[PDB]
Amino acid sequence: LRRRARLSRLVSFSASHRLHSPSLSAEENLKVFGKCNNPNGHGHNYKVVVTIHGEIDPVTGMVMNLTDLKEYMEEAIMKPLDHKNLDLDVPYFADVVSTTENVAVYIWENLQRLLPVGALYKVKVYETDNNIVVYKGE
Amino acid sequence: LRRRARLSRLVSFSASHRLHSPSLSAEENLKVFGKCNNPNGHGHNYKVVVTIHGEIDPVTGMVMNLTDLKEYMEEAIMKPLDHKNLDLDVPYFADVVSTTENVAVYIWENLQRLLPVGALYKVKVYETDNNIVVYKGE
Ligand SMILES: [Zn+2]
Ligand SMILES: [Zn+2]
C-alpha cells in the first residue's frame, strides 16, 4: 500500500461580529453572551488550521499539494470571511449565532463543497489564543 | 446534518485452495503450513460480511440500497470466487499465498474498485466458524 498522513495549513483573517439571538430577549441575550453582546459588535484575528489526510504520493511525496490547499482555503475562508462583519456580510450568519463553534461549522461546509471526497479531516478555529474549537464533521 | 450508520450484508461462497509459498522449499512449506499444505488441496464454505457506512437518506431511509450492495458483492466476491480453486482460478493468488488474511485483502481491493469513494468500512471473512479475519484497509 502507501503510507497515510495528515497535512495541515494555517491561515488567519480579521472579522467582526456580535453574539446575539432573536430567539432570546434583550435581557436573556445579555445574560448569556455578556460583553460579546455589545450592540455595536467587536472583532478578532481568527486563526484557522485546516487538516486533510490521505496517502503520501510515491512520486511527489505529497498528501495534497500545498498550492492546492492554499487555493481551496482562499476560496472557502479568505474570500468570504476576511475583512468582513460576520453577521451582516455573510448570508449564512443571518440566522445563526456567530460563535466560534458556528464559524468552524461554516468553514467545514465551505471546504466540503470544494475538496475531494474524504480529504477533509479537521477544522480548528482559534477565536483568540485561549478560545479554540475543533470540528471534525460529527 | 443526517444520522450516520453501518450497513452490512453477509454472503458465502465455496472454494478450494492450498497454502503454499513458491518462495519456500517444499519442507519449509510443510513446517509452516502443516496439513494446509496438502498437495491436492482442501476447501471451505467461506462466509464474508461486508460493511459500508454513510448517511441515512432522509427520504428512503437507506445508507445504500441493499439491492445495490448485493450487486456489488456479486461482482466483487461471487463471480470471481464462488465454486473456484483460489490458487489456480484467480490470477491474484498466482504469487500470493491464499490465507484468510489475503482473501480478505483481495475482497477489499475488489470492492474498492466498484464502490463509491469512502463507502467501504470493513470486510470480515470466516474461513471456518473458528477462524476469522477482519480487514479495514490499514
Ligand atoms: Zn467574539
Ligand atoms: Zn484452508
- Other beta carbons less than 10 A from residue A119's beta carbon: 20
Angle at B23 between CA B19 and CA B25, to 5 degrees: 80
Residue A53 assigned ligand-binding role: no
* A130 to A123, B33, B136: CA distances (angstroms): 17, 59, 38
Per DSSP, the residues of B56-92 read PPTTT--SS-HHHHHHHHIIIIIHHHTTEEHHHH-GG
- Report the half-sphere exposure of A101 (CA within 13 A, side-chain side): 5
Q: Retrieve residue B133's grid coordinates.
A: 479475519
Kindly provide the b/e burial profile for residues A65-80, where b requires at least 16 CB atoms within 10 angstroms of the residue's own CB.
eeeebeebbeebbeeb
Chain A's closest residue to B3, CA to CA, is A138
| Ligand 2 centroid – CA B15 distance (Å) | 9
Measure the CA–CA gap between B46 and B13, rounded to whole angstroms: 5
Angle at B16 between CA B14 and CA B18, to 5 degrees: 150
Q: What is the resolution in angstroms?
A: 2.0
Q: Which candidate in B52, B108, B117 is best for mutational testing of the A interface (most A CBs within 10 A)? A: B117
Q: Retrieve residue A21's grid coordinates.
A: 439571538
* Backbone Cα Rg of chain A: 17
A5: phi then psi, degrees, rounded to nearest 5: -145, 170
Measure the CA–CA gap between A78 and A11, rounded to whole angstroms: 8
| CATH superfamily placement of domain B1-138 | 6-pyruvoyl tetrahydropterin synthase/QueD (3.30.479.10)
To the query of whether residue A20 is one of the catalytic residues in this protein, the response is no
Measure the CA–CA gap between A21 and A72, rounded to whole angstroms: 31
Determined by X-ray
Helix or strand (DSSP H, E) at B133: strand B132-135
Partner residues linked to A65 by β-bridges: none
* A105 to A76, B21, B58: CA distances (angstroms): 12, 52, 21
With H, G, I as helix, E, B as strand and everything else as coil, classify residue A104. Answer: helix
Measure the CA–CA gap between B89 and B16, rounded to whole angstroms: 10
